[PDB]
Amino acid sequence: KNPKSDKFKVKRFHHIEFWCGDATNVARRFSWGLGMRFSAKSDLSTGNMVHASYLLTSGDLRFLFTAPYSPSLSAGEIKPTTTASIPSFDHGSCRSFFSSHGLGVRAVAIEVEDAESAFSISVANGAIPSSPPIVLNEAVTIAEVKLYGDVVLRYVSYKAEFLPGFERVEDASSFPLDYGIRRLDHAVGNVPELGPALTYVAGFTGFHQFAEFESGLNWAVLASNDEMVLLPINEPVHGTKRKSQIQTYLEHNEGAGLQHLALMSEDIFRTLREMRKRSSIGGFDFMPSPPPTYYQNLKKRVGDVLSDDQIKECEELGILVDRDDQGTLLQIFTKPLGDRPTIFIEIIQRVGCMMYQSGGCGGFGKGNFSELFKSIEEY
Amino acid sequence: KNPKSDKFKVKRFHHIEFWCGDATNVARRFSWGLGMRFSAKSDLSTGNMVHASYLLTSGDLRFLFTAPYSPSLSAGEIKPTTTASIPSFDHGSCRSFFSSHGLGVRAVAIEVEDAESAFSISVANGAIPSSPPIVLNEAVTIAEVKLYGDVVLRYVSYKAEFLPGFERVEDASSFPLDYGIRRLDHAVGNVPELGPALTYVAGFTGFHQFAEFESGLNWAVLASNDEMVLLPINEPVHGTKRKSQIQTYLEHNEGAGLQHLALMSEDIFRTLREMRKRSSIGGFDFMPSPPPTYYQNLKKRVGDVLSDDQIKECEELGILVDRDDQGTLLQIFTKPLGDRPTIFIEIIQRVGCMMYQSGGCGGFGKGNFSELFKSIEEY
Ligand SMILES: Cc1c(C(=O)C2=C(O)CCCC2=O)ccc2c1c(=O)n(Cc1ccc3ccccc3c1)c(=O)n2C
Ligand SMILES: Cc1c(C(=O)C2=C(O)CCCC2=O)ccc2c1c(=O)n(Cc1ccc3ccccc3c1)c(=O)n2C
Ligand SMILES: [Co+2]
Ligand SMILES: [Co+2]
Secondary structure (H helix, E strand, C coil): CCCCCCCCCEEEEEEEEEECCCHHHHHHHHHHHHCCEEEEEECHHHCCCCEEEEEEEECCEEEEEEEECCHHHHCCCCHHHCCCCCCCCCHHHHHHHHHHHCCEEEEEEEEECCHHHHHHHHHHCCCCEEEEEEEECCCEEEEEEEEECCEEEEEEEECCCCCCCCEECCCCCCCCCCCCEEEEEEEEEECCCHHHHHHHHHHHHCCEECCCCCCCEEEEEEECCCCCCEEEEEEECCCCCCCCHHHHHHHHHCCCEEEEEEEEECCHHHHHHHHHHHCCCCCCCECCCCCHHHHHCCHHHHCCCCCHHHHHHHHHHCCEEEECCCEEEEEEEECCCCCCCCCEEEEEEEEECECCECCCCCCCCHHHHHHHHHHHHHC | CCCCCCCCCEEEEEEEEEECCCHHHHHHHHHHHHCCEEEEEECHHHCCCCEEEEEEEECCEEEEEEEECCHHHHCCCCHHHCCCCCCCCCHHHHHHHHHHHCCEEEEEEEEECCHHHHHHHHHHCCCCEEEEEEEECCCEEEEEEEEECCEEEEEEEECCCCCCCCEECCCCCCCCCCCCEEEEEEEEEECCCHHHHHHHHHHHHCCEECCCCCCCEEEEEEECCCCCCEEEEEEECCCCCCCCHHHHHHHHHCCCEEEEEEEEECCHHHHHHHHHHHCCCCCCCECCCCCHHHHHCHHHHHCCCCCHHHHHHHHHHCCEEEECCCEEEEEEEECCCCCCCCCEEEEEEEEECECCECCCCCCCCHHHHHHHHHHHHHC
16 A cells, blocks of 8 residues: 655756765776776865765666865865855764764665755654755755765656766766666665654655564554655564574664665676675675575575576575565675674565566565574584 | 894794774775685684684785674673684774775884894883783784884784684685685885984884985985885975875875885796786776886897787886886786775886895886886876
């Protein structure tokens, strides 16, 4: 059941912004690890004396990496005279965020019809304002409200190239890497209490609970009208045999924040071949692969969707498979992206639900918790 | 003239420690960019609840990358019960360093006969203490004094594997990258006033001025007895046509600090081929190459040392060449390693001065300032 209750017009995920200590090194590591190209910059060379921001793209996926310069470079500026290209940026907020949480997502940005209206409707419906709407070069409007922890939901709307003041990156410095990743499928938060977090976000967005279908967590998924913006939220389950990975996150992160980004691939097998080739030479590592048990049990579950060859290809790459009543999900998880056992990445590809493909086809892997436990015990 | 006045027994450069916001991403970027392998770690997986430290090696070159965890993880510890593997580490100092200076070198570490004695003699001769000698597992002694800015000179001495509490990195996570880099040749500081900086450091080390042979700077080089530890120091020259790059450094760095690390290659042509292949796919960029003028003028200067083929190889890779009365220096400079126009890397190879090769053979490139200016003007 989809009541289609969005309180303003939402289009798609627009970008994810990481707050960094050094944007250059994180951006270069991510570019090589995920096969994303450098497409835009805003930094000293573009006249920005406040922050360094570098944009990576793969398909429609946009990752922005931002770090503060010395405040002394901009000490004479005021907000009317700022050289920052993202006017919500604040030196103190960024340093406090990074010192508190380490490397992680500051902003989940969605494109909307009218960012000013989205901001106003959100705050009228309980959203905690973070940065008021500001029009950039009479062309783009950006506004921010609190999502959870120190993560903001950023609204971006375009009258009619990333943001004003960003310059497209020179061809020589823009190598056309591509491992097949094409868009952000969902962005997941960890919170101490699910109930209040859901009530808050659903309260100011009108996002509805996305219909789905004892190991660590409870969760629910909030979704826009066409279910293309998907925001799952997790809470820990305490008192269990193995300590909840949600609680570990909250401890190492100093509270709520973004847990994982799930990146849709147009060919998950090529993406994982390319990413695993680079794991030990600057890229990303992946979670330990499931026992061959798990793949011996895949035939009975998805043998009508994947061939024996396509299944054996899952086993060599460590890919997980789950299934809805509507579609099939192929998924795999990286190890944490930085020093702390906090944020990680999921690579996914969805099979089925053709009409274009409807959002969330095949779910989020709920059935893979039970399947993995059974495999582990029976090994 | 070498008075051999070291006040304690100095061996070689031991390691360089970067203070980071996220050690993982900087270490992975540097590993791929410079061809250094992951060889040791001290982090949560080794019981260290205080800091994450990752060691990269290439030959005898050791780069250590360190970042703080949340202080909450170790809030119950005191120094007698610390889980830190580097007992000089302090959360507040590290966060203050990184917020002030951005990514950069905290420690220039040299191996000595007796770190306790080196510390005592240094402080008795004017060194400002930073961290007193501490014996690690009855096996290694480490001590630190101030060098310039917030950079420390770290003394390490071994009774008889990097440091106690570090674990060697698993073979699967340790890819044997190697682009030919073999050791640290020199480490260079930028200061506002050369005179007082030289008097201070030479005062507590007994290092002597290394004999050498109007564009931005003045400098001098301090050297150990066998001139294998080489510490040049730069100051700005004000009032010039083009603004001094030393002054730009001091402004963007918030004061004195380490300007460049010069890394000796056993085959600079292979190193630069490998590094330039990776510039746009996560590695390091290089300064703009000199005009072909410069290479047209190389024949008259070093045609007795390099063949026409070896010279043309310099031109395609952008390598600079200078010459002493004793030897020849091949050198090239990266663009800044991170967001700020502060620290960068030099790759070098030295030809001549055979006896082993004596330290500093061919100088530091003093003659390349005049040669580059002449080339530029005449283009
Ligand atoms: C992150 C994720 C999802 C996922 O995407 C997701 C959504 O999008 C929204 C709903 C909530 C949710 O979870 C699905 C399945 C997953 C994992 C995962 O992270 N893991 C790794 C793991 C799980 C427990 C652990 C407990 C202790 C120690 C390590 C552990 C590692 C899995 O095994 N499955 C099977
Ligand atoms: C860093 C270095 C060295 C070097 O190693 C070194 C030592 O070890 C100790 C003695 C002091 C010293 O310098 C040698 C030559 C160099 C450079 C360099 O950095 N550069 C790049 C540049 C120079 C001016 C600029 C002025 C304005 C704007 C950009 C500029 C870029 C060079 O051209 N030469 C020719
Ligand atoms: Co997911
Ligand atoms: Co040098």
